[PDB]
Amino acid sequence: AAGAATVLLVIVLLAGSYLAVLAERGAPGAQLITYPRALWWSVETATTVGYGDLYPVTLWGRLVAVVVMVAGITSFGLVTAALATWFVGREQE
Amino acid sequence: AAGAATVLLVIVLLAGSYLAVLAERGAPGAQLITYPRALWWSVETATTVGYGDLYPVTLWGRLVAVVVMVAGITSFGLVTAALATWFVGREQE
Amino acid sequence: DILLTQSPAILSVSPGERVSFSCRASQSIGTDIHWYQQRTNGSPRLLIKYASESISGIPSRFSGSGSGTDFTLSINSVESEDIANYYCQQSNRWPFTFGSGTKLEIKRADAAPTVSIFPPSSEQLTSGGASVVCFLNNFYPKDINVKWKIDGSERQNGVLNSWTDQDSKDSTYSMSSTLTLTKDEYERHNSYTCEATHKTSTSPIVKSFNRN
Amino acid sequence: DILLTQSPAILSVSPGERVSFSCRASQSIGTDIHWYQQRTNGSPRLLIKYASESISGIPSRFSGSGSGTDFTLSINSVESEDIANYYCQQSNRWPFTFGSGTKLEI
Amino acid sequence: VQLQQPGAELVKPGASVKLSCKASGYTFTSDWIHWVKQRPGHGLEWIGEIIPSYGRANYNEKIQKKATLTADKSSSTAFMQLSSLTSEDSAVYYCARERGDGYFAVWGAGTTVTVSSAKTTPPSVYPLAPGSAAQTNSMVTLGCLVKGYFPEPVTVTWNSGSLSSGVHTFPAVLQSDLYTLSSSVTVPSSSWPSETVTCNVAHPASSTKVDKKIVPRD
Amino acid sequence: VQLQQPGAELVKPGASVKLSCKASGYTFTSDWIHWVKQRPGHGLEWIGEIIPSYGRANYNEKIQKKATLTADKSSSTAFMQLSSLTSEDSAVYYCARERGDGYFAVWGAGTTVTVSSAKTTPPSVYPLAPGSAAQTNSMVTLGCLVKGYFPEPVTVTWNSGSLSSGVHTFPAVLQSDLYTLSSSVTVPSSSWPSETVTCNVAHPASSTKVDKKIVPRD
């Protein structure tokens, strides 16, 4: 709620980024192989921005990616319902 | 609400576009470096259209980008709940 | 660092005929190219922006073409006022870069040099030197052979020549010739002559003056 | 397997004068290049990271340039202590790869 | 004149120099100020940009980062400081006004920088009138001779610009650390000397400008 | 010394060998440990990476997968096992500490591996003092001679490192399965022999280090 679904998104975005590099390293060609841009990629994913920078190529990397989508889009189906509520409320007054 | 969450999106989309060019200029390779296409890029971002044209490469450019996503997706989680309400209502009559 | 590559380096053309400088980038830049003219001694001057759009205050001769990696500045006609270096400059990816540059040369009809010989001014001798300047003006081609003589005998020393870049009112060239002596030396010689053997004239064009 | 290609193989230069080793990749890698110096008998030693960023404890002579596929290690001046092999190494796509190496002769 | 920069500077080698660019016209928040270097007989080297309002600068990755950029947020003048120069660093230096859209709409006139230990010399202007017995054609050619100045450049004008018809200012020659050039003008032998004709030779590097009428040999 | 690996190993052909890399300093969860191979007079071959905390390794696709990677999660030491070697497999083997950002911040000193059936020999160190009648210049040159050791390498030092001024250790020559090199040092003829000077020759492969003062010919 208040800042709860928020925190869960950040667990996802970290552990996601961390595991993406683990799964993708070893696949010849993967760009998703350093902890920085891995993190950026998990934001590119939770928010469905689909910029086209990074994406996974391994099976497990794609599973990790799907977990981020779900756990992100849901978080962000709620973080965005809450920033809308709080500031729109106080700012609407 | 009526046209309130709307206006906030436009503050975001401008100041976003303006800062993107500031952060990205100086990074060898960035395409996000003129105030026009910067603006278009912030729409590409607030609306999660992910066309793949522009995207940032600097750290700060990506932060700016994330601010647009949040403040945009939230605005557009409300601008789109309001155009749905007004015209669907009057048009539904 | 996007590489703009302007070929050819120089461009011959007869007046009034279409001309096209090619720019060619090292990767796609869409339409983020801009053309700059820069004559001799002057600063650059925006010609075409975003590869096709004209600038207000630019002659309609200049026509912007191209997209992707192949770009084409074009001039639908040519006249003498268009002699300059021409530059493309991409704004698609940081940093902004420039091309190597293309200079425009006009083939015109051959013309003979106006020769003018000038004695050292009264003011100049008052110090301790005397320079005989001789002007070759408005000839084409630029290939001309100056020749000094003092009292019929041919002096090869103290001779500073300088060639104009192709002038942009006429498509012609000019040339000066400083003759650095001393006042002491200028006094003990009577005649000074300026001969110029140019393509236009087998017979060399000659000018002279006598202090006496 | 991204191919880094360091030309030239050897580099003659008089002391104090600017010198630039070119690295050139077989496809775009953005800025994920890093330069390593390795003198005789010694282990390699990170010089420039991410193609432009300096390393603390590295002389200001070493100047990182380049982006995309064209990369340029540069030394604004040269002195005798700089004789070594020099290596570029991309981290943009797996596996990490290294260049062929460039030796500096004075 | 939109962008406005001084004419010429002289720097002892290894010393520093500051370069100015006062810009009348608009002063948009979104404006950028760029600097381009043109070595003699070369192309255009982009050096670096600065957005004066906000305050950040970005320099050319690929060149020896010798300079640093600054601005004056409420004087409408921007600066570039070149530190410890050589002779490789002598060139013309333009400032340009990019609106933020990616092209250099407005160009300064350029500042000519010559890095030498030699001393600064004003010029010597001598008239050039035809000989006492040169058969006058319809058009008469006459000039003036700027001798022994340092450093470059010199602005040469005729009647202070009014008579720009038929002029060629010649390139300067060098000799023992002093320059020398000439300029030519052509009027009708009907109008001259009945109409007076003067050549004016500005020399920015010395802060001197001089006049000389080209009278007949009295 | 951040990354720390042994000096030299010797392997009979076809046999195996384990390689160590104890790493003081930090031991981040996110750390990766890489291994680079440098054949004599070659470049750097990346062999493979390992993240010691979690435990997974990835080897070089393109080379003969002769090795396998391991770690000790609470000894801060990682390992690489090379199985069934040839002479193509003799090289220097570095371990590196990539933080997870994509560059090798920290490098071990390298382990020199020589795959031969020949036996291990300690070195023989002989002093090198000038002749009994060599005219002494301002600087005096003197050295020591390491003869008949196997395998490579030998760490050669002067006064145990304090006098690193004016030294050239020469490359080893090979001859009938034994090595031989020399080192040179230069001090002022004022300071020596009044100041004592010793060369110390470590030989990791044998686990022996030896000393020799370079006295005058008494």
Side-chain angles (χ1 to χ4, degrees), chain B residues 1-88:
Chain B
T6 293
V7 160
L8 183 73
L9 177 73
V10 199
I11 287 180
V12 172
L13 287 204
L14 289 183
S17 156
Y18 183 108
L19 285 151
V21 152
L22 211 83
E24 285 276 284
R25 285 208 185 189
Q31 327 189 78
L32 192 33
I33 68 179
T34 76
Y35 292 128
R37 68 180 83 115
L39 182 62
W40 167 252
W41 160 87
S42 36
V43 199
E44 268 196 42
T45 298
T47 46
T48 59
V49 156
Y51 271 155
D53 297 7
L54 300 324
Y55 46 84
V57 278
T58 74
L59 157 60
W60 282 74
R62 290 177 170 153
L63 303 159
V64 167
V66 172
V67 174
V68 172
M69 300 166 209
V70 179
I73 283 182
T74 325
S75 295
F76 227 78
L78 280 39
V79 191
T80 325
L83 261 283
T85 54
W86 175 216
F87 231 56
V88 31

Side-chain angles (χ1 to χ4, degrees), chain F residues 120-134 138-139:
Chain F
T120 306
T121 323
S124 283
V125 182
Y126 301 131
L128 289 168
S132 285
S138 99
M139 307 299 289

Side-chain angles (χ1 to χ4, degrees), chain D residues 4-9 22-24 35 86-88 98-102:
Chain D
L4 291 323
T5 320
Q6 271 163 273
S7 196
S22 210
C23 191
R24 202 185 246 256
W35 292 91
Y86 285 87
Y87 295 98
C88 55
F98 288 80
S100 36
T102 310

